[model samples]
Target: MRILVTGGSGLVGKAIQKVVADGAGLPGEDWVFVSSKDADLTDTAQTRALFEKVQPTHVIHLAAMVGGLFRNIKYNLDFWRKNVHMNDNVLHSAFEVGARKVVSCLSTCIFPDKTTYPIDETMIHNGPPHNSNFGYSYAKRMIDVQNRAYFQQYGCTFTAVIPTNVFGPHDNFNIEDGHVLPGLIHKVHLAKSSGSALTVWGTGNPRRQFIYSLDLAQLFIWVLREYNEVEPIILSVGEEDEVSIKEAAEAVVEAMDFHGEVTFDTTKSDGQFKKTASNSKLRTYLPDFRFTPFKQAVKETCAWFTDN
Candidate 1:
């Protein structure tokens, strides 16, 4: 089978590439990982052209206009417009090429902001997502909508995997707009070198579930080959392991071994307080799947950041 992976230069993409190269694939299964450098996904013709050239029997679509909380909040319109266009082009192009299956990426941050604890696959559109990233969330929610439509109208097997906040070695480390963990790790590095206090955004009370990009990659591969439903499945750790922003920063500090003072900026917004996603669905499927311990994953990521 020829497999095409779009958005194949980021954290999760690189992890998938590593996993596949490390013998995740069976014989005769070819994988192609493409980024925007290969073809601009927002442009329909380029997206379709890339798909036509690949003639992929299966596709893993992850291209989108994505950013951190502050970036999303500031440029909500652009996020909505660009991602809507990209998702539309990629899914339609894959379907046009007669790709047998397409697995797209979604985020747990899109789950309802006002809902109960531990959201599962069935509750994506139950209510509105948190206001901090509304534009991105709606755009992502449409993927599930499109998947169901594609299945019903044309018998196409297009699905998505909703992962918790993802982080790894190659993550964007910008302090102002990067993801919280990566940003803190970056801050730790700076604090260590410059002898400055590590200042975390918000009150550090907000909690979230994080999945190492490599772990998410393994699950993504499983979804591509084994999952048959058009409905999205959440790939996340259990609710019991959720960590507050303060706890996560502590982990980063310990992993990086930075002795600098750690502080919080209470004036900043904490986005959603907690987006604890349920993984019982995954538990039923892979009863023995083990996630890399969060501290160990953080330590590895810190090491990579320092090395690079």
Candidate 2:
């Protein structure tokens, strides 16, 4: 099968690239990785042109405009418009080209703001998402809607996976516009190099379940090959693996060997306190799948940042 991966130069995409390079790829599978440099997915014609060129039978759609708290709070409209347009373009192009299957990526943020503990795949549209990034969250939640529509009307194999916080090598290391883990890593790096006190925003009480990109990559491959369902699945560690931001910061300090003081600025926003998701669906599929320890993964990411 010819498989095309959009957003191929990104953190998760790079992890998949490594997995395939390390002989995880199956025989007779032709993989192509493309970034925004290849085509702007928001434009329908450009998206279709890309599909025509690649002629892929399968697709892993991971392209999206992503940012952190402040950016999301400021540019909600932009996030909603761009993501909605991009999703439409990609899915329509795949349908027009007769692609065999498409696996899209979603985030746990798509769940309701006041969700029950251990949120599952069934609660995506039960209520509204958190207000901070509702634009991005709602747009992503729509992918599940689109997937079901495609399956009901055309019998297409289109589905999604909602992963918890993801971090690893090749992640965006920007302090302000990156995710929580990578942002912490960047802050600790700066604090170490500049010999300044590390200022972590918010109360550092918010909790999250972080999955290493490599482990998520392996699961993504399994979903593509074996999973046969229209409903989106949650790809994440169990709720027991959740860590508070303060805990995550302590790990980063240990990983980077930072000797500076760590302070929490309560004046800033914490975004969401928690969005715990259940992996029971994934566990039911691969009960023996192993996840890398959080500390080990953090150390490896820190080393990669230092070396690069």
Candidate 3:
């Protein structure tokens, strides 16, 4: 089987590449990972050209216009417009090429703003997403909607996976435009070198469930080969694994061995108080699946950041 993976330069993409390198593939499966350097996905012709060249039997649709909370809040229109275009092109081209299956990526942020604890797969469009990044959230939600539509109209097997906050070796470490953990790692690194206090944005009260990119990569492979449902699945840690932003900051501090004082800037907005997603669906599928310990993963990511 020939499988094409878009957004192959990002954190999760790199992790999947590593997993495959570590012997996660079947004997005859050919994997092709590509980034925008290979083809601009927003352009229909470029996307079609990519599909024609690969002629993939399967696809992992991971490309999107992504950014951090502040960026998402500032450029809602760009997020919505660009993502809508990119997703449309990718799916349309995949269907046109008669790819047997397509697994797209979704985020927990697509869950409702005032969601109940331990959000599940069924609550995606139950209510509006948090205002902080609604443009990106709504765009992501459309993937599931689009997947279902594809299945209904053409009997296609397009699906998605909703992962919680992901962090790993190849993550974007920009302080203002990266995710919380990577941003903290970046900020703490500067703080350590300059002997400045580590100032975490917001009150540090918000909580999140983080899935190491490598772990999520393994699950993605499983979804591609084993899962048959067109519905999206929540690939996340259990609710009990949720960590407060303050706790996560402590983990980063410990991993970096930084002794500086850590402070919180309350003036900034906490994007969401919490977005705890349930993994019972994933657990039922693979009850014995083991997750890397949180601190161990953090240390590995820290080492990667320092080494690079």
Candidate 4:
């Protein structure tokens, strides 16, 4: 069973690639990585051409315009447009090429600002996502809609996986556009190295969910292997509880061994206060699924940043 992974060099992409290429004893499967040069998923013609040539049994669409809170807030137009184009181009290309199963990745931020106590796939379109990540959120939501429409109208077989904040080896460390965890990790590490204080945005009250990149990839493949339903899996991976932004930062400092003074900037936005998905459905369906221990994953990520 051949699989084509778009965004193969990305954080989650690399993790999935590592598992597929090296996971000999962990529900091993046949797969290959396809980075932008191998196949530019953002370009429709290129994407279609790739799909045709690959004729993969499955297509994992993880390419998108992702960024940190500040970048997402400041560059709203770019974020939305980039994701829209990439998602649409890749989804259509995959379907046109006769790919049997295509799995798309969405974010927990797709849910509106605190719309549901325990967010699920069903609550995705309930309202606008947190203001800070609105641009990225909308783009992902549009893709979700497109995926469903393709399935309903064209009888396409595809699935969408919604994972919370992901951090692990291979995550983008670019401060301008990286996600919160990596950005914070980079910032604190830099602060420690320079003996400077770190300024954290918001009151540190907002809560967010996070998953290890490899854990997410393994779980995603597990669902794809065992289940045919897309909605349930999306909700399941998200059902893992959340960590407050402040709590999350403290964890980072400890993991990185950063001795910088952590101060919260009250004027800056904190985004959503809490985002916990109800994974009861997934746990019920999969029965034995497990999430990675948070501290262990954090330590591994910090080790790489510090070692380098």
Candidate 5:
């Protein structure tokens, strides 16, 4: 199948690319990567031209502005606008072209802050989104609604996978725009190298779930190939543990062989007190689905960092 993976340089997109070509059991050589430099998706004209060029049979829309607590707070406006435009260009251009299937990324943050701790797919967009990463969350929510609308109204085939906080190789260690995992990874790495105490954001009380990039990639490939149901699907799945930022920091320290003190700044905001998802929707299709252990995933990520 001819495929296009957007955000080819990103953590998730890279995993998707790996799975489609080399990770999945069934493999052929017709997949393509669409980088930001090659295609500025925000420009409608560029999107149109590229769609006409590729005529992809499938499109994985993973391109977007992503980050952690600090980025959302600092570049809120760009976060909202760029993300919305990128989605619009991909969805509309795919419609304009002849793509048959499209897989998009939706975040767990789309679940409302007031939502019951572990949210289900049905509860999404039902209330105000968790305001900590409000802009990024809102954009993903909009894309979800748009994808559904396109499918219902235009008979488009698009599935939104709401993966929990993902971290692994190729992850953006940029503390400014990176999420907690990579940011913590960077902090601990630097601290270990410099033999200094690491300062963590927030009170370290917020509970969040993280999935490894490789596992998520495998799941994406599985859903794309095996999950061809007509009904709208949301892979609202996550891991087994709900850890605090403090716990996560210690884990990262251990993973990186960092012997520094991991300190918490109560003044820093712990975005969501806790966030998780129900896998009922995905389990309805693949009952035997399994997730990687969080600690192991972190260790593997650290290994990747070392190798790179």
Candidate 6:
């Protein structure tokens, strides 16, 4: 089986490569990981050329124009247009090549803005996503729409999975545009090195269910090989595992062994406050799967950042 992975240099993509190298893939499976450097995914000709070069039997579609809150708010239209075209190019090209299966990654932000706690797979499109990120959210939600269309018209085994906040090695560490965990990790590292107080953004009270990228990688491979549903599934830890930004920062400090003072800037925006997702669907399938302990994952990520 030839399997192709797009966005193959980001956090989850890098984690997928690590796991595959560690023997996560079965024998006879040829895996190809491609980044934007390989081809411009939003261009039909380039995307088609990529598919032709790989000729994969399976594809894990992860390439998207993802951004931080500020970036999302400032360039919503760009996010929507770029992602819509990129996803269309990839999925349509996969269909043109007759790939047997495609598993695309979605996000918890696809849920409505005023959503019920512990969102499930059935809640997408129930209402609008947060106003700040409507463009990106709508585009991602449409992946599910396209998946169903492909399955009904052509019997293509195309599906998507929604994951909560994910962080690990190779994550974006820019403070202004990065997500909560990695941003804090970066700030703390700088504070320690420069002997300054780390000013964490927001109230430090918003909760999020952060999933380790490596663990998410395991589930991605499992979904690619075993799960078969046109409807999207949520790949996240349950609500009980949610952590506040403060707790996450503390973990970062402990992991980095930073001795500097920490403070909160409450005026900053804490996007969503909380958007916990349910992994019950995943648990029902792999009941015994265990997530890596939170502190340990942060420590390993910190080590990676420091060394690199």
How high is each candidate's TM-score? 0.99, 0.99, 0.99, 0.92, 0.93, 0.98
Model 5: ten consecutive residues of lowest lDDT: 230-239
Error of 3 at 303 (Å): 0.5
Encode model 2's per-residue lDDT on 1-308: one tens digit a residue.
99999998999999999999998989999999999889999988889999999998888999998888878988999999999999989988999999999999999977898978989999999988999999999899888889999999999999998899899999998887888888988898888888899999999999999999999999999999999888998999998999999999999999999988999999999998889999999999999999999999999999999999
lDDT of 4 by residue, 192-304 (tens): 77889987878988777788888887876766666676453553344445677887888888898777588888998776677788776667776676777788788889898
What is the per-residue lDDT of model 1 for residues 1-308, given as tens digits with 9 covering 90 to 100? 99999999988889999899998997889899999999999999999899999999999998888788999989999999999999999999998889999999999998999998879999999999989899999999999999999999999999999999899977889987788988888898888889899999999999889999999999999999999989999899998989999999999999998887888899998888888898988999999999999999999999999999
Tell me which of candidates 4 and 6 scores higher on lDDT: 6
Give the per-residue Cα lDDT of candidate 6 at 289.
91
Q: Could you give candidate 5's per-residue lDDT for residues 135-164 as a string of tens digits?
A: 888888887788778878988877677788
User: Going through the candidates in order, what is the number of backbone clashes in each?
Assistant: 0, 0, 0, 2, 0, 0
RMSD of 1: 0.8
> Which residue pairs does candidate 1 place in steric collision?
none
Q: How close is candidate 6 to the true structure, as a TM-score?
A: 0.98
lDDT digits (tens) for residues 1-308 of candidate 6: 99999999999999999999998889999999999989999899999999998999999999999887777878899989999999999999999998999999899977898878778999888888998889999999999999989999988999999998898999999887777788888898889878999998889998888899999999999999999888888999877999998899899999998877889988988778878888889989999999999999999999999999
Alpha-carbon runs more than 4 Å astray in model 4: 24-29, 235-240
Which of 4 and 5 is the better model by lDDT? 5
Off by over 4 Å in 6: none
Runs off by more than 4 Å, candidate 1: none
- Which residue pairs show backbone clashes in model 6? none
Stretches > 4 Å off in candidate 5:
21-29, 229-240
TM-score between candidate 2 and the true structure: 0.99
Off by over 4 Å in 2: none
lDDT comparing candidate 3 with the true structure: 0.94
